[PDB]
C-alpha cells in the first residue's frame, strides 16, 4: 500500500453464534478454500469443549484469543550499518491477527490425531494460560523487554 | 518452404500417414490451421487486411 | 494418487478408463 | 500368524497382509479371499486355523511367488541380455530400458548423482 491505508475487509458474522471473530478464526483454519470443511472443524471442536468442559465454547474462544494477543514486539532496523531490534507497541488490528494465526500454527503441531481435536485442546490450554499458543506469545515478549536496551528509535 | 517440398507435399504418397499440411500461401508446415489452411503468421497477416470473412478480433 | 494409474483419481487424471474407473 | 512361502504378515487385515508377499498385490489378495470366503475385515491373528490352511494351500499351488518369482525374472533378464538385444544392453548399462530420456530425470536407474567438472 503506497497511496492509502487501504480499507479493511469486513466479514460476515457466523451463521451459528454470529461473532465475526468466529468467521475470522475459521478463515484461518481453511486451506484451499474448503471453507465448508473448516467450518465443521470449528464446530466439532466446539462440541468437544462442551463435553470436556462445563462452559460455553463461545466464551472459551474469546478468552483464549484474549490471552495470546502479544502487546509488545520486535521489528528489525538498520541504523549504523547494523540490525537493531526495536521493540514496539503493537496496534489492535495486528494483535487479533497474530493471535488467531498462532492459535492455529500451534494447534496443527499437537501430537493429536484429528484436526478438530487439536483445535479443541489448543483452545483450552490457551485459556488456562499454557500450551504453545501462549508460549509463542510469551517468547516474543521475552524479546520485547529483552532488548529494551533499544527503545529509543 | 522449398519448392522442392511444397509442390512435393502435394502429390499423393504411397502411405496415407505420410501426408502432411503446408500453408497454401507461405508454404510453411509447422503450424497451419486446418480451418483456413494458412500459416499462423499468414492467418494474422490477412486477418488484418480484412481478407478472412467473419474473422474479427476477439474481445471479452 | 494422481500418478497411481490404478486408482480412482489415478485414472480421472489420465482421463483413461479401466478396471478402476468404469462406464457405469 | 504364519508362512506363505516363508513369510509372516500379521496383526492387520488379511487383504492388507497378503500384499506383503512378493507375488501378491492389492488384486490377487482380494481374488484369493473371494475364492475362499474368509471375510477380509478380520485381522490375521483372528483366523480359524482351518481358514488359514485353505488360504495357504491355494496361494501356494497356483501363483508363482517369492522363492520362485525373483528367480523367473532374474533369469528372464539374463535372457535378452545373453542376446545382443538392445533392451539387454540398457540393462547392462543400468540405464532406462522402457525408453525414457538420458539427459535429465533418469536418476532412479543410476542411483546417486555423480557430479563432474565443466566450463561456463
Amino acid at each position: 500500500a503506497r497511496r492509502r491505508r487501504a480499507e479493511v475487509r469486513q466479514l460476515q458474522p457466523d451463521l451459528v453464534y454470529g461473532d465475526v471473530l468466529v468467521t475470522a478464526f475459521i478463515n484461518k483454519i481453511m486451506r484451499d478454500g474448503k471453507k465448508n470443511l473448516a467450518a465443521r472443524i470449528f464446530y466439532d471442536a466446539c462440541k468437544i469443549i462442551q463435553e470436556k468442559t462445563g462452559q460455553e465454547p463461545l466464551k472459551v474462544f474469546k478468552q483464549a484469543v484474549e490471552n495470546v494477543k502479544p502487546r509488545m514486539e520486535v521489528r528489525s532496523r538498520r541504523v549504523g550499518g547494523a540490525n537493531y531490534q526495536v521493540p514496539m507497541e503493537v496496534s489492535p488490528r495486528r494483535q487479533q491477527s497474530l493471535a488467531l494465526r498462532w492459535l492455529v500454527q500451534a494447534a496443527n503441531q499437537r501430537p493429536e490425531r484429528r484436526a478438530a481435536v487439536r483445535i479443541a485442546h489448543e483452545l483450552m490450554d490457551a485459556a488456562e494460560g499454557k500450551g504453545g499458543a501462549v508460549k509463542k506469545k510469551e517468547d516474543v515478549e521475552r524479546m520485547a523487554e529483552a532488548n529494551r536496551a533499544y527503545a529509543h528509535y | 518452404a522449398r519448392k522442392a517440398l511444397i509442390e512435393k507435399a502435394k502429390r499423393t504418397p504411397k502411405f496415407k500417414v505420410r501426408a502432411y499440411t503446408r500453408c497454401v500461401r507461405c508454404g510453411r508446415a509447422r503450424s497451419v490451421y486446418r480451418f483456413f489452411g494458412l500459416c499462423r503468421i499468414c492467418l494474422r497477416e490477412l486477418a488484418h487486411k480484412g481478407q478472412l470473412p467473419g474473422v474479427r478480433k476477439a474481445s471479452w | 494418487g494422481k500418478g497411481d494409474r490404478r486408482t480412482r483419481r489415478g485414472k480421472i487424471w489420465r482421463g483413461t478408463y479401466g478396471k478402476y474407473r468404469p462406464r457405469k | 500368524a504364519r508362512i506363505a512361502g516363508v513369510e509372516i504378515p500379521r496383526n492387520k487385515r488379511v487383504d492388507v497382509a497378503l500384499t506383503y508377499i512378493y507375488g501378491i498385490g492389492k488384486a490377487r489378495a482380494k481374488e484369493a479371499l473371494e475364492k475362499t470366503g474368509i471375510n477380509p475385515a478380520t485381522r490375521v491373528k483372528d483366523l480359524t486355523e482351518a481358514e488359514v490352511v485353505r488360504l495357504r494351500e491355494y496361494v501356494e499351488n497356483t501363483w508363482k511367488l517369492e522363492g520362485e518369482l525373483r528367480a523367473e525374472v532374474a533369469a528372464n533378464i539374463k535372457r535378452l541380455m545373453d542376446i545382443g538385444c538392445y533392451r539387454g544392453l540398457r540393462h547392462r548399462r543400468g540405464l532406462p530400458v522402457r525408453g525414457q530420456r538420458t539427459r535429465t530425470n533418469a536418476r532412479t536407474r543410476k542411483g546417486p548423482r555423480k557430479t563432474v567438472a565443466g566450463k561456463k
Partner: protein, 98 residues
C-alpha cells in the same frame, strides 16, 4: 410448416435479411413465430503476434456464426410468392426444410 434457418457472419446482415422475411410473410401469409436467435457459435484463434518467437505475444481472433430462425405455419401458395425471389443480403446462407 416452413422451417427457415438463417446462418451468417454479420449480425446486421441477418437482422435485415431476417426482417425482410418477416415483412412480406405477414402481408400474404398467416401467423409467423417471429425471428429467434440461437445460440451463436464462435471459432477462436490464438496466434502469436510476432513471426519469430515470443510465446508471451499472442493476438486473439474470433469468428461468429450467427443463427436466426423464422417459422411460418399455414404456408400458402401466395406466401411463397413474396418469399420466392425477393432477397438482397449477400453474406447470408439460407436453407429450408418443411
Amino acid at each position: 410448416k416452413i422451417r427457415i434457418k438463417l446462418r451468417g457472419f454479420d449480425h446486421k446482415t441477418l437482422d435485415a435479411s431476417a426482417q425482410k422475411i418477416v415483412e412480406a410473410a405477414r402481408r400474404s401469409g398467416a401467423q409467423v413465430s417471429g425471428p429467434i436467435p440461437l445460440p451463436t457459435r464462435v471459432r477462436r484463434f490464438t496466434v502469436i503476434r510476432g513471426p519469430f518467437k515470443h510465446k508471451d505475444s499472442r493476438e486473439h481472433f474470433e469468428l461468429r456464426t450467427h443463427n436466426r430462425l423464422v417459422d411460418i405455419i399455414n404456408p400458402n401458395r401466395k406466401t411463397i410468392e413474396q418469399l420466392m425471389t425477393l432477397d438482397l443480403p449477400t453474406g447470408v446462407e439460407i436453407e429450408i426444410k418443411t
